[PDB]
Design a protein around this ligand. Structure first.
Ligand code: SF4
Ligand code: SF4
Lengths: 337, 340
């Protein structure tokens, strides 16, 4: 259960810029809400088209598609803005979970103390609105809380993305991750080399991350690719995912070391679409969730470096941004150009 | 003609000074795409392969090519259909080698039942064989009629799953040369004429009966009768975007008591839509999607024409075709290069 979408504030914003037709994109868990919002803005004299693709991040705005079908603006549900040039005015509408993080923290104080006195705290967008309460609670328990601002791919200090842990690159004896799943906590452990404790707000369960098994299974994938002679280097056209210079460099690099290499252009990166190609191994240079989370070895740019022996220590693939001036609001936002 | 003219392609590329090209390919030519790329790269042209699986010239990857800085696009497996293109595009049609005459001779007794004046049609892969099929049928006493088709078609006599314009000519019965049932079925429902399909490989013939198919559609329409919320889908694929027609359908459903929302997609498939509240869908893009579903759609999915029947505006069934305008010329039987 999440907090309700700010229909009124949204409508007001569209009217402010004067918008007659808008495209609404939404993530898996907000399909029913996207239609409610559409039926609402329509009764208010605004033509609405729903984006039928399932959105997975602000790194993939449907501004191009909006343009193509004549929409004045774009409404992006469920995610906050990340620095990207946009072709049509876009209103981001973050989703905030109501579950209490503090309750999950109080249940696990003992485990958190094992982390250290000065600790780095991180969380995902859905709990970012409760980060301040979590910080004050931890401080009242004797911790010094270090929260990093992060870079331009990030919306709020302390927020991590599966492909970006810049807010965690600060000083601390250990890292506390507030949220569910193991992908974020795992990336944090690999990216920072510090001990990580993950606490799931819903179940209140805790997990001490051990990257070992993960790194092992990845090396096994690297080993298999060591025998390959033919590689496919994949990029995605999604605005916040396109890493062409980096892909072109991996191609040049595989060739230098006696491998055949081909740059492959896609939108959604699905191994399923590549089964008929002759490549023996693949390198995905886009969202790292793809290779890190395939009948043939699929790797990240970092792993291909390791495979070619040009890198020794295992590293998590990240999409970094440059410095960020301000922070996004804890509510909707409008962005243009 | 039955091979990728690597050298003819390099020539046309060197001629326009292309340095970086994107190559798209259908499922059956994935390995050919990479061999062509290897060949072009040995000749000073950077090559990128489009990773998506292509299903027709109705889905050119010129925009994507533009997005990654390619100065040209190579479209393998299909011939050109009229559409604006953002970069010079070379179309490399696939031509099957099989000679079709033997299979016609074998079934000459069945072809006779179509009548004296017959309409002859085939798909892209056997198009170069139409001249021979014509000479044979004429040498057997038939009067062969071959329609030019519209701008969505590349050569006279060619049908597409969504376009049977070449068959809208004077003629008693229709002969279809090819394998598979989708095309012959589309012909029968689109022209409401008698269709005889002959497979050039097996020499097997088939008199087409749309009855089964039509009943199945009525059924589907029935299942949507008690639906109130409708999703009306369009695809942003260049040769498939039918925005005006989709909007019209949204307006029509609303005027008739139903709720309807226009949905924009690229690849149209049910899974992406499962989370939406809509009870029924209307696909206003490629007709093969709703008319040839193997079972991926868990909710009733219809074509624009079927909606009109459901709403009670149309009485007889009609095939959802994507029509083009007059075509001034015909594409070559080999590669072609276009730039709009
Ligand atoms: S690149 Fe991948 S991890 Fe990063 S925001 Fe997009 S979908 Fe999420
Ligand atoms: S039948 Fe569908 S995929 Fe084939 S050419 Fe027509 S629109 Fe394109």
């Amino acid at each position: 259960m999440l907090h309700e979408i700010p229909k009124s504030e949204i409508l007001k914003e569209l009217k402010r810029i004067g918008a007659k037709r808008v495209l609404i994109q939404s993530p898996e868990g907000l399909r029913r809400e996207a239609e409610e919002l559409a039926g609402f803005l329509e009764e208010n004299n605004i033509e609405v088209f729903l984006h039928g693709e399932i959105n997975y991040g602000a790194c993939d705005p449907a501004d191009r598609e909006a343009k193509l079908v004549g929409c004045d603006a774009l409404i992006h549900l469920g995610h906050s803005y990340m620095k990207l040039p946009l072709e049509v005015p876009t209103i981001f509408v973050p989703a905030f979970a109501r579950v209490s993080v503090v309750e999950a923290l109080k249940e696990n104080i003992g485990e958190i103390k094992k982390l250290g006195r000065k600790i780095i705290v991180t969380t995902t967008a859905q709990h970012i609105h409760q980060l301040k309460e979590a910080k004050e609670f931890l401080e009242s328990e004797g911790f010094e809380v270090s929260i990093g601002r992060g870079d331009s791919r990030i919306s709020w200090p302390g927020q991590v993305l599966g492909c970006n842990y810049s807010v965690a690159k600060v000083r601390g004896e250990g890292i506390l991750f507030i949220g569910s799943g193991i992908f974020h906590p795992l990336g944090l452990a690999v990216a920072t080399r510090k001990k990580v404790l993950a606490i799931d707000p819903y179940t209140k369960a805790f997990s001490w991350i051990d990257p070992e098994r993960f790194i092992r299974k990845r090396w096994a994938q690297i080993a298999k690719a060591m025998d390959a002679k033919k590689f496919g280097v994949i990029v995605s056209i999604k605005k916040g995912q396109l890493r062409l210079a980096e892909a072109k460099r991996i191609v040049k690099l595989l060739k230098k070391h006696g491998r055949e290499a081909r740059l492959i252009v896609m939108n959604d990166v699905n191994y399923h679409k590549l089964e008929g190609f002759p490549f023996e191994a693949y390198v995905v240079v886009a969202c790292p969730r793809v290779p890190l989370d395939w009948r043939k070895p699929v790797l990240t740019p970092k792993e291909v470096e390791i495979l070619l022996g040009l890198r020794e220590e295992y590293e998590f693939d990240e999409i970094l941004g440059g410095p960020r001036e301000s922070d996004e609001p804890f509510g909707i936002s409008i962005h243009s150009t």
